[PDB]
Design a protein around this ligand. Structure first.
Ligand SMILES: Cc1ncccc1CC(=O)N1CCC[C@H](C(N)=O)C1
Ligand SMILES: [Zn+2]
Length: 139
């Protein structure tokens, strides 16, 4: 689990969104596994605006942060789960690293700020849903 809080927005994995997230929906994209809901309180996470391919991610199944090299956001084939049939997920970044299903929502950060959140995994490869292109998160 996990979320990004920026301005009056909450960014979460779409497959983990709550009834409150859907009742205050701002934007959602099944192809990216992203959902953004509105908040009353103001968040102060910083979103990275860059093309960094190195960063650090939080892995809750190990209570540890790991440094990783990751690919640029792209369309990647993702196996079926209880939340989606087999499909291509867009804006996804892969790295060699550990993850388990409950790790979804852990933040990936570079020197510029928040890059994305864990969204997929398996076979020792972890995938992060990018948020750097969502320029509206700051206004
Ligand atoms: C994160 C993880 N790590 C290892 C094994 C398995 C997983 C879980 C995983 O990949 N999923 C399940 C939930 C929805 C995901 C999606 N965006 O389609 C795919
Ligand atoms: Zn960066």
């Amino acid at each position: 689990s996990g979320a990004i809080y920026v301005g009056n927005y909450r960014v979460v994995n779409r497959h983990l969104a709550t009834h409150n997230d859907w009742a205050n929906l701002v934007w959602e994209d099944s192809s990216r596994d992203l959902l953004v809901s509105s908040t009353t309180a103001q968040g102060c996470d910083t979103i990275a605006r860059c093309d960094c391919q190195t960063g650090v991610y939080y892995c809750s199944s190990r209570r540890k942060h790991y440094p990783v090299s990751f690919s640029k956001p792209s369309l990647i084939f993702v196996e079926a789960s209880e939340y989606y049939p087999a499909r291509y997920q867009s804006h996804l970044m892969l790295a060699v690293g550990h993850s388990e299903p409950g790790d979804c929502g852990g933040i990936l950060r570079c020197q510029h700020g928040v890059v994305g959140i864990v969204s997929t995994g398996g076979n020792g490869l972890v995938g992060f849903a990018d948020v750097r292109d969502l320029l509206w998160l700051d206004e």
